[PDB]
Design a protein around this nucleic acid. Sequence first.
RNA 1: AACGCGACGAUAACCCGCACGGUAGACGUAUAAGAAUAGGCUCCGGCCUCGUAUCCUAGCAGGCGAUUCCUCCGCCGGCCUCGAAGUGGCCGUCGGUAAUUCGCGUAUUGCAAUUUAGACACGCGCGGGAUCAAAUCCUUUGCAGACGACUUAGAUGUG
RNA 2: CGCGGGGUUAAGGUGCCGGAGUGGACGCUCACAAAAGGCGUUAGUACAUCUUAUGUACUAGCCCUGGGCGCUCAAGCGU
Lengths: 137, 185, 204, 108
Amino acid sequence: AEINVEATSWRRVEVGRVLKLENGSLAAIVEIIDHKRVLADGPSSDPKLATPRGIVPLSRALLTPIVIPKLPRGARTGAVKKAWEAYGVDAKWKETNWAKKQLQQERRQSLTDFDRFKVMRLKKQRRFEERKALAKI
Amino acid sequence: GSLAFLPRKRAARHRGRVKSFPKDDPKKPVHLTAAMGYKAGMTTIVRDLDRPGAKAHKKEVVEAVTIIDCPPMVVVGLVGYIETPRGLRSLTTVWAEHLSDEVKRRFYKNWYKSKKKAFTKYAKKYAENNGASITRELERIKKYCTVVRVLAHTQIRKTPLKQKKAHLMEIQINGGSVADKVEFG
Amino acid sequence: MSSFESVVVIDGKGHLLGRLASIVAKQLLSGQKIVVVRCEALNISGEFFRAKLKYHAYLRKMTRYNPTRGGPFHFRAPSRIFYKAVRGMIPHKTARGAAALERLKVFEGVPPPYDKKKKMVVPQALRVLRLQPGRKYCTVGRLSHEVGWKYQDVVARLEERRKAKGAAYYERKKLAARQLSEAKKAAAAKVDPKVSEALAAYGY
Amino acid sequence: PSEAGHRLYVKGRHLSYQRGRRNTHPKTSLIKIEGVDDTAAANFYLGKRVAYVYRAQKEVRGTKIRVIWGKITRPHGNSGVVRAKFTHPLPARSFGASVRIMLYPSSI
RNA sequence: AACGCGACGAUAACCCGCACGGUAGACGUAUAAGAAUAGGCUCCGGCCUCGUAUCCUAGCAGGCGAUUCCUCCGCCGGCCUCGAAGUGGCCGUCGGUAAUUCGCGUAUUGCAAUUUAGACACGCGCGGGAUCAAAUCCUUUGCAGACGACUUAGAUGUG
RNA sequence: CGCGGGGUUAAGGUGCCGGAGUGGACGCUCACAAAAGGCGUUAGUACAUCUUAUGUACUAGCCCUGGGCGCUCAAGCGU
């Protein structure tokens, strides 16, 4: 009576699932409209992560592993903000690897030409300790 | 006349290409696939028939046969064939020492005007130790080819004919892995 | 994102025929050299038998074809089925059109120049990105094999050999991935950590 | 030794002239700048100098290199293609040939 | 396929004169798993929207001498490897070699007017004196022959 | 409707040939002729059972029968 099934465990869409829009802002689903549209809201204190309450097309969105546990359905902006601060969505999103890639990307894009000359010089110094280590092993 | 043979055209080659070989499987023993002979003549045979269902059982069929002379076949060369999306192709061919006289006059056209230096720097390559190339060439046959045909000729010097020019064809070795049929070759 | 390459090699597996042909023909006219490998692994949408009528329909509307250049010749290999697609998308009666086809170079399987090189993919012509999941599709290899292509088992066996060589390539790349990651961890203790934070504050 | 490049230009390709179905006007040319994909990126390259460099198989100044100079006038389409006007129109057989887009005049 | 192709055998030189140094488009023209997309990878810790990545990248178009480093690159040999339309690895010789820290010269090319720098085919291509190797022709032959056409055999020999 | 430079358009178009979107939203489809045959799919209407989800007939789509290349979560149709 042993069953070994290796299938794909996708992420549910549900009330409480927070999702990522393309502008870098998060929103918590509070009621599902159709198979293609849900209505969501992000009450984050961060100006970069805030999202107005409204319809989010799921094609434009991306499902994140974070989920609010017992978010009531159709909860108004105050009630989602209460669950937002209690569960700490912003802290969990910063730990999420998707945000580190975003923060790496933004810091890379803000590099000026003179700070680009550091990195060319600076990776060269780091690379030199890499090669005597690589030649050792 | 049959449409499968018309339009009628002369054979562009006197010997005639075999055009088809039996299919090869490794499980059989190593053996060759063809030989050349010389049409000497034809005679009469009486035979004790033992064919079931035949009213001529245990009786004397009179039949006509042909006598095809077959001189011992001197083996001179080996060829290996590699498989390509544009069909089969020659990857390489290899020969031996001491190539006999009548096989060069096939390689030539005017024996008497020309002088005898066919296969000279090839035999010099065999004697002056480029053996790594023959080690390269024989192993190249082992590793890559999938069809190996041997190169051998008949000898006029044994058979009663007024010619002296030899006759070359390629004869396959089937029945084995690619490793076995080259060491035999 | 609109980068100019010397030659770009397109893997043909899982790519739709005419969408790959339309993208390739625009790059050839723009001045890009194209090499297509695995033309036997291309895909044509719809069931196999729908591909059979349009093969029979093309031979219908042409009285007295040339046996060597056209007619059923074009369907007798997968490489030249694709070449027939790109040629109808390019002004072949102009010298600009002839020049664009000389930039193209199509193959069945992966020849030895191009198995050591990098094979890219075209997202806008991928079958699994453009076709609905329930829709049925055919392979151009089995289209040409049922027309008269003779080397389907040939290109198969050379490809299963190429996988075996590729298996040894990863096993060498595995060991390089161990040593590179180990050397990164090993030299990080003596990496002068005034400068390690400098790279982290710059994105590297 | 440096072992570095010396390129100070963006690479481009001469696509075609300004044309309809069948009426081509040679006095304006179409350039695909490498890296530009929207009309927004094309707005950076407007009024930048553009050179077409080729070889002629005769030395007139000790060199077989000849240059035709021009400028990027306006964006074209939605895909970042730009319109270029040169002192003389580009040949015709340069359709799909390299074009050097300089970074001057600069407003950065 | 006489206007497709592969392998192999045998294969043209010195002297004198004299004319010039292409390519539908190099400028870092760097990057090899396979396979699936109702899954997959792995260092077995974990990881995958994102190639928005990785390598390389400073100096007279990149000098000289140091301090200083045994890192990187290149050429020849050896050992192996690569054949679907052939190539890379390792070792050794030699040459160069900002990971770090300096002292020397660049100008008046006078505020832009070509950044005259790669790869391949042979250096482009020619006229008179100068040498092998074959074939065509010749004689002959008959398994071939309407005529052409085809095939033997002629130079030392089982002629 | 004179000869030129620049800008904007109409009718038509923006997958390639071909300048311009493999653009965005929502559905449907896999190729003569009649109240015609569909145990193909979707959309709507009218009747009947039910702790005492269904099953019968229609209406509307649109399909099976009655320029090249190529396309099918379209490069087809409607807005």
